Short mmCIF file of C-alpha atoms and ligand atoms in Angstrom, two decimals:
data_model
loop_
_atom_site.label_atom_id
_atom_site.label_comp_id
_atom_site.label_asym_id
_atom_site.label_seq_id
_atom_site.Cartn_x
_atom_site.Cartn_y
_atom_site.Cartn_z
CA UNK A 1 -1.92 -13.24 -12.40
CA UNK A 2 0.92 -10.97 -13.59
CA UNK A 3 1.10 -7.24 -12.70
CA UNK A 4 -0.79 -7.46 -9.38
CA UNK A 5 1.15 -4.72 -7.55
CA UNK A 6 1.50 -1.41 -9.34
CA UNK A 7 4.03 1.29 -8.51
CA UNK A 8 2.54 4.79 -8.17
CA UNK A 9 4.33 7.44 -10.32
CA UNK A 10 2.43 10.67 -9.38
CA UNK A 11 0.30 12.07 -6.53
CA UNK A 12 -2.61 12.42 -8.94
CA UNK A 13 -2.45 8.68 -9.75
CA UNK A 14 -2.77 7.93 -6.03
CA UNK A 15 -5.73 10.33 -5.55
CA UNK A 16 -7.59 8.60 -8.43
CA UNK A 17 -6.71 5.05 -7.42
CA UNK A 18 -7.92 5.39 -3.83
CA UNK A 19 -11.33 6.70 -5.07
CA UNK A 20 -12.24 3.25 -6.45
CA UNK A 21 -15.24 1.27 -5.10
CA UNK A 22 -13.04 -1.52 -3.74
CA UNK A 23 -10.33 -1.97 -1.17
CA UNK A 24 -7.09 -0.27 -2.32
CA UNK A 25 -3.94 -1.26 -0.37
CA UNK A 26 -0.91 1.06 -0.51
CA UNK A 27 2.58 0.06 0.63
CA UNK A 28 4.56 3.20 1.65
CA UNK A 29 8.26 2.26 1.68
CA UNK A 30 11.75 3.68 1.29
CA UNK A 31 14.71 1.93 -0.36
CA UNK A 32 17.09 2.84 2.53
CA UNK A 33 14.65 1.16 4.97
CA UNK A 34 15.09 -2.66 4.84
CA UNK A 35 12.03 -3.49 6.95
CA UNK A 36 10.00 -1.43 4.44
CA UNK A 37 11.37 -3.32 1.39
CA UNK A 38 10.08 -6.51 3.00
CA UNK A 39 6.45 -5.38 2.36
CA UNK A 40 6.64 -5.87 -1.48
CA UNK A 41 7.00 -9.73 -1.56
CA UNK A 42 4.38 -10.03 1.23
CA UNK A 43 1.90 -7.86 -0.69
CA UNK A 44 2.62 -9.89 -3.83
CA UNK A 45 1.44 -13.02 -2.01
CA UNK A 46 -1.59 -11.24 -0.49
CA UNK A 47 -2.63 -9.75 -3.89
CA UNK A 48 -3.21 -13.30 -5.22
CA UNK A 49 -5.30 -14.26 -2.15
CA UNK A 50 -7.45 -11.09 -2.34
CA UNK A 51 -7.66 -10.39 -6.12
CA UNK A 52 -10.82 -8.28 -5.53
CA UNK A 53 -8.61 -5.70 -3.76
CA UNK A 54 -6.10 -3.50 -5.64
CA UNK A 55 -2.49 -3.41 -4.46
CA UNK A 56 0.04 -0.62 -4.91
CA UNK A 57 3.47 0.44 -3.70
CA UNK A 58 4.79 3.97 -3.25
CA UNK A 59 8.37 5.03 -2.72
CA UNK A 60 8.13 7.93 -0.29
CA UNK A 61 11.40 9.37 -1.66
CA UNK A 62 9.81 9.66 -5.13
CA UNK A 63 6.35 10.71 -3.92
CA UNK A 64 7.04 12.58 -0.67
CA UNK A 65 4.06 14.83 -1.40
CA UNK A 66 1.71 11.81 -0.97
CA UNK A 67 3.58 10.69 2.16
CA UNK A 68 3.22 14.16 3.81
CA UNK A 69 -0.47 14.58 2.77
CA UNK A 70 -1.34 11.19 4.28
CA UNK A 71 0.74 11.83 7.39
CA UNK A 72 3.02 8.83 6.76
CA UNK A 73 6.19 9.03 8.78
CA UNK A 74 7.27 5.52 9.78
CA UNK A 75 8.51 3.08 7.15
CA UNK A 76 6.83 0.86 6.15
CA UNK A 77 3.28 2.10 6.54
CA UNK A 78 0.38 0.28 4.85
CA UNK A 79 -2.68 2.41 4.25
CA UNK A 80 -5.96 0.85 3.20
CA UNK A 81 -8.71 2.80 1.45
CA UNK A 82 -12.24 2.24 0.33
CA UNK A 83 -14.12 4.81 -1.75
CA UNK A 84 -11.66 7.58 -1.08
CA UNK A 85 -11.85 6.85 2.66
CA UNK A 86 -8.99 5.50 4.83
CA UNK A 87 -10.18 2.31 6.54
CA UNK A 88 -6.93 0.95 8.07
CA UNK A 89 -3.31 1.77 8.77
CA UNK A 90 -0.61 -0.68 9.79
CA UNK A 91 2.86 0.61 10.65
CA UNK A 92 5.75 -1.90 10.42
CA UNK A 93 6.29 -5.25 8.71
CA UNK A 94 3.50 -7.08 10.54
CA UNK A 95 2.08 -9.81 8.24
CA UNK A 96 -0.92 -10.97 10.32
CA UNK A 97 -2.04 -7.41 11.11
CA UNK A 98 -1.75 -6.45 7.44
CA UNK A 99 -3.53 -9.62 6.20
CA UNK A 100 -6.43 -9.26 8.61
CA UNK A 101 -6.82 -5.53 7.82
CA UNK A 102 -7.03 -6.62 4.17
CA UNK A 103 -9.45 -9.52 4.80
CA UNK A 104 -11.75 -7.26 6.84
CA UNK A 105 -12.11 -4.79 3.95
CA UNK A 106 -11.66 -6.74 0.70
N1 GSH B 1 9.93 -1.48 12.58
C1 GSH B 1 11.37 -1.64 12.72
C2 GSH B 1 12.03 -1.14 11.44
C3 GSH B 1 11.26 0.04 10.86
C4 GSH B 1 12.16 1.23 11.04
O1 GSH B 1 13.27 1.22 11.91
N2 GSH B 1 11.87 2.28 10.31
C5 GSH B 1 12.74 3.40 10.37
C6 GSH B 1 13.62 3.15 9.11
S1 GSH B 1 13.98 1.44 8.48
C7 GSH B 1 11.87 4.65 10.50
O2 GSH B 1 10.96 4.94 9.48
N3 GSH B 1 11.88 5.49 11.57
C8 GSH B 1 11.06 6.71 11.48
C9 GSH B 1 10.56 7.45 12.73
O3 GSH B 1 11.27 8.29 13.32
O4 GSH B 1 9.38 7.28 13.17
C10 GSH B 1 11.76 -3.08 12.95
O5 GSH B 1 11.25 -3.70 13.92
O6 GSH B 1 12.59 -3.67 12.20
#
């Protein structure tokens, strides 16, 4: 499918998206951080394997409010939510950790 990873544009968009009754996966990244830019293509592959989960990316330098509120400091950080509730966090570009956190909750 096309359009599987959406880029967040406001804090309010994030707050709404994470409230969904499904797993919502959010890639927190920064363009100056290479390791963090590696999460996008990985998440693109995972989104097709777990289409029942929603996938998003968030540039912390555009949406620093969301980063601070969710206590994200290290780039990349993947945060996983279900029903407004954080169910997992994976810091760093760690494909197996991220995939299994997804598979557990999707
Ligand atoms: N996880 C590191 C790269 C990730 C990294 O060095 N992140 C830096 C920027 S690319 C960072 O967010 N440091 C923040 C901190 O002080 O916790 C790796 O093994 O390649």
